[PDB]
Amino acid sequence: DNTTYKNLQHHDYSTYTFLDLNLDLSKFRMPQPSSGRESPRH
Amino acid sequence: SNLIEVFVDGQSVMVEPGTTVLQACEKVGMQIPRFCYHERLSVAGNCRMCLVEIEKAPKVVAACAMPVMKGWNILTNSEKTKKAREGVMEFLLANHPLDCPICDQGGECDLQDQSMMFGSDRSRFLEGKRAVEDKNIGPLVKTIMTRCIQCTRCIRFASEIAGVDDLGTTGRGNDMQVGTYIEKMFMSELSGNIIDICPVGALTSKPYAFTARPWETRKTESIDVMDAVGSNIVVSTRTGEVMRILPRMHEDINEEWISDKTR
Amino acid sequence: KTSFGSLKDEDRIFTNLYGRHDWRLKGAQSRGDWYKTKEILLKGPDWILGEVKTSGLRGRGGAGFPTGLKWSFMNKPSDGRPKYLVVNADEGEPGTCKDREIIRHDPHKLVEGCLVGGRAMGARAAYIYIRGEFYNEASNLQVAIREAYEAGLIGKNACGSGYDFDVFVVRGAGAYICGEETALIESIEGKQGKPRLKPPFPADVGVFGCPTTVANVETVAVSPTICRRGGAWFASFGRERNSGTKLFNISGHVNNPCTVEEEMSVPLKELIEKHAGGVTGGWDNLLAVIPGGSSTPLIPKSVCETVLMDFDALIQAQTGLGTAAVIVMDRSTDIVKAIARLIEFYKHESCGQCTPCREGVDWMNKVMARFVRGDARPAEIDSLWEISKQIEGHTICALGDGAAWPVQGLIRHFRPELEERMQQFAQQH
Amino acid sequence: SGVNNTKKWKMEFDTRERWENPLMGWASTADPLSNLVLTFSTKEDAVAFAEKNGWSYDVEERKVPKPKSKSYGANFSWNKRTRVSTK
Amino acid sequence: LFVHRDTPENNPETPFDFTPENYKRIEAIVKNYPEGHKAAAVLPVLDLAQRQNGWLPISAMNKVAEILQVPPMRVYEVATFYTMYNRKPVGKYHIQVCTTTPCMLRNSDSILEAIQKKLGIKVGETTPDKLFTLIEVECLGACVNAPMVQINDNYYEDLTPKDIEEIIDELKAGKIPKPGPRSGRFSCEPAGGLTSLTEPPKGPGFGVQAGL
């Protein structure tokens, strides 16, 4: 078919949809690198 | 051995790698005009008054930030360089207030002096000017922020030298403003130094206000006794009266700062 | 070849541009995404960079630098710091909305593009910076990214190739200047979106002070197809040094404003008529066209008759391809007002960091406001021209140039309209 | 920031009393050298001039600002404290 | 204004805290960035506070500065630089009409005029019932669907004065109108029938170069 819009999932997205996905992805991420200090002011 | 050769108006000069174009020029006695650059602060590169032509390069470079490359010929007085300075000076003065008679910086103002030496002699700005509300930051530093040219020297000094991150820029574009956002006093033992580094009369000494003009004061080079550091100072006097205290550069002591008590 | 256009569907890259097929992983794979990705990664960074080089691909974010050479600045040994790919999805140029379609309808092309482009650079992760207003689009991208992670296509041992690669989505907060590559990096680092001076270059000191490459969404998303189908396949489209296919946004006074994929060097007239339905009120009703987003100078109808849509042809016409956003103005348009509004846009978007744009663009805006009403003298036209030349080439970033060029385009091609407006005002007053 | 007033050597004399004029409050003086300031190309020239005129003197060695090591890229350091938090 | 003056409604003692579920979201946000560079999370975290609260009182800015150990001024700079942050309360629905040239050329003025007449406000104002705030914005990246508006997180596109009044009518009733174009087409494809991508897309491996 080529006559229907198939991007209707975003009609149900809410305020926290983006950050919930980010939280969900948190387990998959590789460990972050480290600059060696807690911040540039340390 | 590591030194590289660069040219300043055809004059050869040997510089360490990493030397900026502005630092190459001062090695032959040329002082590039500047506003945002201070050699004791981090490089900013935002005022654009230091733009200079490099021979064979279509684009002018910011001399204060651009590292000099081997074989470059820096044209500090070419037509392209002069027109770049005139353009930047024109933009700096477009919104600047007609305050020189009432402004304490008058007579020792880098904006006045570099306008005389590197800018045009007239205006073609036909619109109305920006006006900015004043911020109260304590009993020592008076702010007339319509005079501010957004050089960010005070912000960098506060964060880097005084270690206080209370100054910043709020807003965007032409309406970008330097201040604390909230009402807050910038009270630090080094706070008075932002008066010296501010190139304009945006930040001035509250105690000193309106009392003297720079051309009429006599300078006595002396020493501070408010502590045991022995900071080198200049005592401004007029007609037998002490009018203010200014830092005197001594690289091994107070480099060019003094404490608020000394000031 | 000497004629370019009529791109066939089999040669189009963004085959779900209009979102009429499943945009999720299953749909993406049925359309060829994520196919032999493992073989591409194991071919090596040098092979990938060669394929992008031979493709003749140039940046699609507005400036058009050769992509293969740009990405090769990263192809250097490690010095202890991580390496990053930053994908520019800020999509802020007025008239330009192409990257929006890629992100929401072909997200897996972008995700694969990050991995392949990331491999060629040696980068450990990709940060996709997407403008805050694109909330629904960013959420679509996050869903696609999660599918890739679950399928093992990204992350640890990505595509079973032994290469670890993360993909992070970071949202902007409303600022056109954050599309500028160094301002984008400053924004990711949690600062005001103010561009950095160069040097250093991002390939040396970039995001978090680490080697970085900033690439446009379209530039990244076409890379996996280039590796699959070959650089020579890409270079067979368009003129020499103007290779490939391009996404065009035709907006303004056309009958059917739309986004379409077409061959580079297609005639501008052909693009507007074949795909956009022609200029509103007929071709002869055309006044001026902004060929590549609000930052490129306008060109009059006479120039528009024969001009080709590619980097070199439009530079020869005293303008630029830019983002390939075609804004069409017919003769009913108040051309002076239309340009004045773009100057008002740049005045609102200037970051305020550096003097010529902070003060100059606002100054140009005030002069243009008076030029709209005729409330000026003709001698001010040359003054406005000179002011624009004092901004161009004197600022930290190219936003200053982007505000100067539209003014220059108006004075170059429509000076009589400006002068006529002034005569009318003076007579009335 | 201008450095053009730091090129030449100067010779000034010791400061002496100034008092308020009773009539107007103006600053009076009895020091005939209160305003005298001479300019010299080198410290040697200034020293020579003082010697032949019989003035005892003190010489202060010229203070030069030492060369700094400036680097814009240090504002964005990956792991050093030179990273700036604002621009 | 880009300066702050304490009021009874907006001062450091105004109450703001993140909910326990938002603290978990912050934890995942902060982990997206290298250790030693937590300041990178200021924008997403500051945006998160705006989503919980609707706008950013000075106390919300201070809280974010505390959590990420950045000076408050560096958060004030971010809040005042980026236009999507609301430093004053807005209405339940924030209507943002694009008026840049591409949308101007397709009569965004009519859309802006229709909203004002229906809501009985002017650009920049909030309705007395505090349901709607109206402002003009720059190009929203939906140029080919001009004229268009953003309401909160959603785009409404290909608008006409009647269409935007029916969207506002739905919002008043409490219903949620579906986003996207209102002229018939679904997204950015040309109206009157596709001029490309009519054929089915090729499958996996089509046109792949030999040796790969």
Ligand SMILES: Cc1cc2nc3c(=O)[nH]c(=O)nc-3n(C[C@H](O)[C@H](O)[C@H](O)COP(=O)(O)O)c2cc1C
């Ligand atoms: C004011 C301004 C806005 C820009 N906006 C974008 C943008 O929204 N998207 C983009 O890809 N590039 C934008 N750019 C260009 C980028 O700075 C940079 O050239 C580009 O991301 C490089 O990617 P590319 O080589 O694939 O083209 C902008 C530049 C300027 C000066």
Ligand code: SF4
């Ligand atoms: S800062 Fe300088 S130029 Fe400005 S009013 Fe004061 S003296 Fe005049």
Ligand code: SF4
């Ligand atoms: S107040 Fe003075 S030092 Fe601070 S940014 Fe303005 S001009 Fe520069």
Ligand code: SF4
């Ligand atoms: S040109 Fe404008 S946007 Fe670019 S750095 Fe300068 S002030 Fe900021």
Ligand code: FES
């Ligand atoms: S002194 Fe170089 S840009 Fe300011």
Ligand code: FES
């Ligand atoms: S001009 Fe309105 S969305 Fe681009």
Ligand SMILES: [K+]
């Ligand atoms: K001062």
